Amino acid sequence: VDSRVDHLFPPSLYIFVIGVGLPTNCLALWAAYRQVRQHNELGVYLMNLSIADLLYICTLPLWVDYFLHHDNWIHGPGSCKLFGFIFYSNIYISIAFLCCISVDRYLAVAHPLRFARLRRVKTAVAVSSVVWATELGANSAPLFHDELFRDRYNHTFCFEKFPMERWVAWMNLYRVFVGFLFPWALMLLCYRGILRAVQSSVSTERQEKVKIKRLALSLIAIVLVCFAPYHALLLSRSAVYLGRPWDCGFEERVFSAYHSSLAFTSLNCVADPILYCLVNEGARSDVAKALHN
Template structure:
């Protein structure tokens, strides 16, 4: 029988406790004094399932449809969509585990999928890196425009993701929570760095230009969107968990914990919706240009 240490931040940073010492109580019963956030969290998970799955499938379809005229970052967006679809399949099991089940066996399955989701910033970092090279080092970007190295990088990220998820599934690795914290902090710092450098590069785009070059402007917006996702979805766990001692154990376990991870998990819906919105805007612009051409 695994042990649930209330004061161990590892269990929270690892996304869920390994088990509990409350007898046969479910997680919902343990948090019955603070049920609102738990209900909110489960609501976000089911939004992920009902909205995130079709949105990510549409992303996959658009990438496949436009593969002849796709951006170099689409290969990473494709893999990120696949990762999010896998994660969005677990809400029914999570609902049953939180509200009805007291067994620890389901945590192994859930922790594996949580591990997959924890690694999603790696694909976001790859997208940001691709945009950074395109804007700051255009000559190098042109030389590396073939997608073979991007495919290799995507495979490497998947190997890291599966290894991390398997290790998280085991659940008893000492100081494993530091891997998650380091990964999120590194991804966040990398996104900020890329965004600042790209902004600086765009402002140096040339004397006498009132507007940014369309290609650079599109790259800047892509990195800015990725940065927004990182800040909104992935930074809360890193920002809140270091202050665990300032909260009571029950408040942290039943409130802070689910607020942080609820926002993080919701990226499975936000990311594809933002991508689809961008594609819709581009489609509208193309239609307007076509209509203007016909009128002329």
């Protein structure tokens, strides 16, 4: 039931994420909008992704103090329900737009000459709206229940309880299995298909093929290295609470790792612009033509 001193790692990783994402996710948003202007349906997804990790980034300050102040912030018994829900519900939105891009890259490279209706800007808007709606609806149970819970150990939390409630375990399991592995499996399969289709192009020079390979592998590996520790610890917590709830002895030995990994989950906000709208020579031109405007 106790805790530790997490005022060093996620007092600083969040600051770095803010300071590197605010001036880069905005430029990724600009590049995505430029893509949308010239009838490129990928940009829509890209654009949404930027939104998905801008309104997330602006949520961090309310939390950095939560981790600078030793594990408590009294800023609103009704405020850790619409700013803090966002904190826990963009990791599962961004990843979805990570998947939507991958399929859109599978359907255009692996299956050209087909599926022209699915690569319109209109259908991109429809899919993006459905993604937003379903992600904001499935993760909507924390809005209902009371969240700001105070212990006697001098710290009160925002959206986490120690030991956690029964309903939290089932949503944690759902998050792990239907917000991380399913979109990640789709990304892996789609980039596998793209590599398998591009290994037959007559018009690629045995070098761009290697560049595509080491870009797709990185795209499917950064998501893993950023989200895996958190969901591994989340599944571990939700499997120990559902075998022995009263004997909350596992929690004390894993609280620090849990919070450090939750902080580490925030590196996708700086990985996404770099890997998606700033690494290639095309969007980088539309960015360098905007830093001078």
